[PDB]
Design brief:
Length: 273
């Protein structure tokens, strides 16, 4: 069963903030090394149509670190527990979840436990798995390169941030943007960041996909170091009821760089599913 905390309890624990208005509610879930502030480019349009709920994963942003554990948050199932607990505790129903990157998988795990409160998922630049299993799956990242990334976190954290920020944001983008991500990386507790990075880039959730029965809208970045169009394509083929749209853009953060491209589309999806 899913624990039900006092509404009062999850709010402070997850730094929950509610804006907009109306009966239809959307829940926005951030990606690795970020927080709810990365949604600020989409919020205004979303708030014209929905009640918008944002939050910080325990350990992330301004969430309560007192709730963080390396045990629970060792894998994405502990993150999914965050979502399941917020939905149960606020007793929300008919929620559309919009997830960035890893939150695409987290939302999907949560939908296997509390599917009854979730109407659909929107997945922005998702990946089920970053490693390669050729020929039939190429996550795009060799084990040797991933080993080197996680290890760089131990040797030189500032170096790690400077390397990964442009990778995720897309090197063609502004210093303001890339720099915002490296700053977020830097201000995130190093143990949270290290265990979240392993749970994100070292996991394999391809077998999950066929068990996601919730309608899923996938946005695939046309040029994405972290996830090629074949990754998005693979996902749509395996999530039973899914729909992929390819977006002409660069980087792994379309909700930040190209909110104008994806927002009207996901709004239409959530309104008419
Ligand atoms: Na609506």
């Amino acid at each position: 069963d899913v624990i039900c905390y006092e509404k009062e309890d999850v709010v402070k624990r997850n730094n929950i903030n509610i804006t907009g208005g109306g009966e239809k509610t959307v829940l926005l879930a951030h990606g690795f090394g970020c927080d709810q502030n990365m949604w600020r480019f989409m919020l205004p349009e979303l708030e014209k149509q929905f009640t918008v709920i944002v939050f910080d994963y325990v350990g992330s942003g301004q969430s309560d670190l007192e709730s963080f554990s390396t045990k629970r948050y060792s894998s994405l199932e502990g993150y999914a527990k965050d979502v399941e607990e917020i939905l149960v505790a606020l007793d929300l129903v008919n929620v559309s979840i919009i997830g960035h990157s890893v939150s695409s998988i987290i939302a999907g795990i949560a939908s296997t436990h509390v599917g009854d409160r979730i109407s659909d998922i929107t997945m922005i630049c998702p990946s089920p798995c970053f490693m390669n299993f050729p020929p039939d799956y190429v996550g795009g990242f060799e084990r040797d390169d991933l080993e080197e990334l996680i290890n760089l976190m131990d040797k030189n954290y500032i170096g790690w941030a400077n390397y990964l920020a442009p990778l995720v944001m897309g090197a063609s983008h502004s210093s303001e943007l890339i720099g915002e991500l490296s700053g977020s990386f830097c201000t995130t507790d190093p143990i949270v960041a290290k265990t979240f990075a392993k749970a994100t880039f070292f996991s394999d959730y391809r077998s999950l996909l066929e068990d996601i029965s919730t309608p899923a809208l996938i946005f695939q970045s046309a040029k994405d170091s972290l996830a090629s169009p074949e990754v998005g394509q693979y996902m749509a083929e395996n999530i039973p009821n899914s729909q992929l749209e390819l977006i002409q853009a660069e980087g792994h953060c379309l909700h930040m760089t190209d909110a104008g491209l994806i927002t009207p589309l996901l709004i239409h999806f959530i309104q008419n599913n």
